[model samples]
Target: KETAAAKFERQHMDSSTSAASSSNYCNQMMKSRNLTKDRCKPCNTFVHESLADVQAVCSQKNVACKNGQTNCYQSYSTMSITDCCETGSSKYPNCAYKTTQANKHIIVACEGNPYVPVHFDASV
Candidate 1:
């Protein structure tokens, strides 16, 4: 019998290959996130921030900054700080210094998990 992971992987592949919408894909990803304990750890999830906002985070944490790179806020588990994005994902090029953007996402890597996760609106 195929393992649960294998079954889910197959289903994911099928859905991804089919005409599933981006929202459907996002829902599937969120379901997978709920199933995986690693991602659902106790911490904020929505983290929408502009470049300046991310810079402020770095400043508050006293992390040195270098141009063209998102400053590291903290280490993500065993992974070094390099894995984390200094700023939000490149997918959202227009994200910077907006109040609504801040409320839209949660800022992780601040206290728990030491991992800064960013989400993208694939529809955009």
Candidate 2:
């Protein structure tokens, strides 16, 4: 089974894609990264920071998760990220997405013994 920390990295990390110029980025990435395996993910954000930097977010300030869980933390500084939103006409096995890049503070949920990011709750 994939651990939460591992899943977070697979779905959200994009250190090499700091500035995605192509609009097709999300559409291609969402599929290539295996997020579009069974169905289209409505929304997701890929952080363009190092895994170490993202991991450090666990030590940041606390915040209420979107689900009202108290395990969330928000980054103190803005980080480069690409937001992927599914297109209205998107269909399963043919998922399409719109990509937008921005610098924003990220909120994530952490867990386990070493306590690292498990879920990308949101960005602001």
Candidate 3:
């Protein structure tokens, strides 16, 4: 049996190579909208568009939308506009949270039995 630290290493240490594909999609979208230069902020642009647009984008990219994972990506907020003051833009801009959920951390046997992998906040 492996120690706790070893188990953590086996699970979390593995990099998600497939994640780059999804990141590329986001980069493309940002580039097309001329939002590439700006650093994407979460919990701020969540209100710019309806949920349908978000879902559609995820579908097109084959991404996953885990429930209650709103903070997984950037959001727009009018009250907190730290990322939106660059060019007199609206306090709320475009933001989205998407995940492929394909590449996941897998924990091997360490305790009595192997524990299932758990996904943490991607954005955080």
Candidate 4:
């Protein structure tokens, strides 16, 4: 069975590419990463850093999640990230995206006995 933690890794983790140059990065990665199984994910973000670093965010101070959950923590360091967003021309099964990248401190929700990241809340 795929754990929620691993599901987060699949949808969000991409350490190989950094600030992807080609626009195809979003279109292709979305499909290959299983984010475009039947329909499409309208908006998503990929972090271009090590999983160790990303997971370490849980060690930071607790903050409120997007829905007011208090299990969230904000990263103390800025990280390089790629934002994949839907385009106006986008349709189901034919997902299109606008790719953007930025270096920012991210906020995420953590859980489990090991205390690892479970959800990406926001960035600042």
Candidate 1 per-residue lDDT over residues 10-101, each given as its tens digit: 22222222232332333344344342233322111222223334323422332322332343342122110101111242133222111111
lDDT of 3 by residue, 63-122 (tens): 223564322322221111011112224233444434232322211122223332222223
Model 3 collision count: 9
* Model 2 per-residue lDDT tens digits across residues 1-124: 9999999999999998666688999988898889999999999899999999999999998999999999999999999999999999998978999999999999999999899999999998
Error of 2 at 101 (Å): 0.7
Off by over 4 Å in 3: 16-123
Which is the winner by TM-score between candidate 2 and candidate 3? Answer: 2
Q: What order do candidates take by lDDT, descending?
A: 2, 4, 3, 1
Tell me each candidate's TM-score: 0.21, 0.95, 0.18, 0.94
Q: List clash counts for every candidate, in order.
A: 6, 0, 9, 0
> Ten residues in a row with the worst lDDT in model 2?
15-24
- Candidate closer to the true structure by TM-score (higher is better), 3 or 4: 4
